[PDB]
Amino acid sequence: VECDFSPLLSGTPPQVYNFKRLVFTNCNYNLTKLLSLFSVNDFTCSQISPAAIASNCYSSLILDYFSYPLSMKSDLSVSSAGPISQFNYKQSFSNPTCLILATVPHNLTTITKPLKYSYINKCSRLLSDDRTEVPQLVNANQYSPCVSIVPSTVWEDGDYYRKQLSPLEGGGWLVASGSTVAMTEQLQMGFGITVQYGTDTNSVCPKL
Ligand SMILES: *[C@@H]1O[C@H](CO)[C@@H](O)[C@H](O)[C@H]1NC(C)=O
């Protein structure tokens, strides 16, 4: 009983390409309890609504969280190119999702700020001909192929990262570049919620 959103409130939220995932089964949630702590700037859903998501019974609820600057709001949509959706973070297009952009108030103190926001501006793979570059896109619910070579913080805007690939990996080179955005007065964050419905497995219910 009782879903635990605590880990979200303790410490420094990772950068978008290192999003932390909290998984819930068999428990009871109060979503509007959690959002009461933040100033909520944006809240959009897919195949569900902000009202419905705060009040439905699911077989599973997944909550991704990460530091994210409000200024890159538009880059979250799969429409566009956008480094974010292509190389950093992508929600399921099959299951009902929600995305929330929130600022953390001064009076919320247990959440510490990083030096800046970092993201991956490019993730690509150079073929054997040493000419052709093939983008390495992030899949839903997965991390970037490049998370192994990109550090948790981008040191300097424009930094490049390369890895030589073994023949088991198909050969060639993995190439990534990182970008930075300056930290804001109050930290800004993103929350990705994904829900699933079952037949009898709908044990994630709002508390009454
Ligand atoms: C859930 O939390 C919100 C926080 O604003 C509160 O208003 C509401 O009464 C709570 N609901 C239940 C059933 O605890």
Query: Is-contact 180 116, C-beta < 8 A?
Result: yes
172 and 199 part of one domain: no
Instruction: Indicate whether 7 and 74 sit together in one domain.
Output: yes
Residue 113 in tokens: 């700020």
**Cα(95) to centroid of ligand 1, in Å?**
26
Point out the ligand 1 atom lying closest to the alpha carbon of residue 207. Answer: 13
Q: Angle at Cα 115 formed by Cα 111 and Cα 121, nearest 5°?
A: 110
Task: Compute the distance between CA of residue 165 and CA of residue 61 in angstroms, rounded to an integer.
Answer: 36
> Which CATH number is 148's domain given?
2.20.210.30
36 in the same domain as 93: yes
Token pair of 3 as six digits: 């879903």
Structural biology method used: X-ray
For residues 177 and 188, state if they share a domain: no
CA angle 120, 73, 151 (to 5 degrees): 20
151 and 190 share a domain? no
Quick one: 135 and 205 in the same domain? no
Please give the tally of structural domains in the chain: 2
Q: Are residues 158 and 205 in the same domain?
A: no
First to last CA, the chain: 12
CA pair distance 3, 38, nearest whole angstrom: 18
C-alpha of residue 3 to centroid of ligand 1, in Å: 14
What is the resolution of the experimental data for this entry, in Å? Answer: 2.5
What is the four-CA torsion angle of 26, 143, 97, 83, rounded to 10 degrees?
160
Mutate to test the pocket of ligand 1, among 5, 30, 34 (most ligand atoms within 8 A of CB): 30
Token pair in block for residue 137: 């896109």
Q: Does ligand 1 lie within 6 Å of residue 47's CB atom?
A: no
Number of helices (H), then strands (E), in the chain: 3, 11
Same domain, 86 and 177: no
Dihedral, CA of residue 96, residue 82, residue 172 and residue 175, to nearest 10: -120
**DSSP annotation of 85:** I
**Counting Cβ atoms within 10 Å, is residue 204 exposed (0-12), middle (13-18) or buried (19+)?**
buried
Q: Which of 45, 48, 52, 143 is nearest to 101 (CA)?
A: 45
Question: Residues 109, 21, 85, CA angle at the centre, nearest 5°?
Answer: 100
Residues 111 and 24 in one domain: yes
Do 111 and 144 lie in a common domain?
no
Select from 91, 87, 73, 66 the least CA-distant residue to 7: 66
Domain that holds residue 15: 1-115+183-208
**43 CB-contact burial (10 Å; exposed 0-12 / middle 13-18 / buried 19+):** middle
Look-up of token digits 């070579």: 149
Strands across the sheet with 173-182, in order?
133-135, 116-126, 173-182, 160-164
In this structure, what CATH number is given to the domain that contains residue 23? Answer: 3.30.70.1840
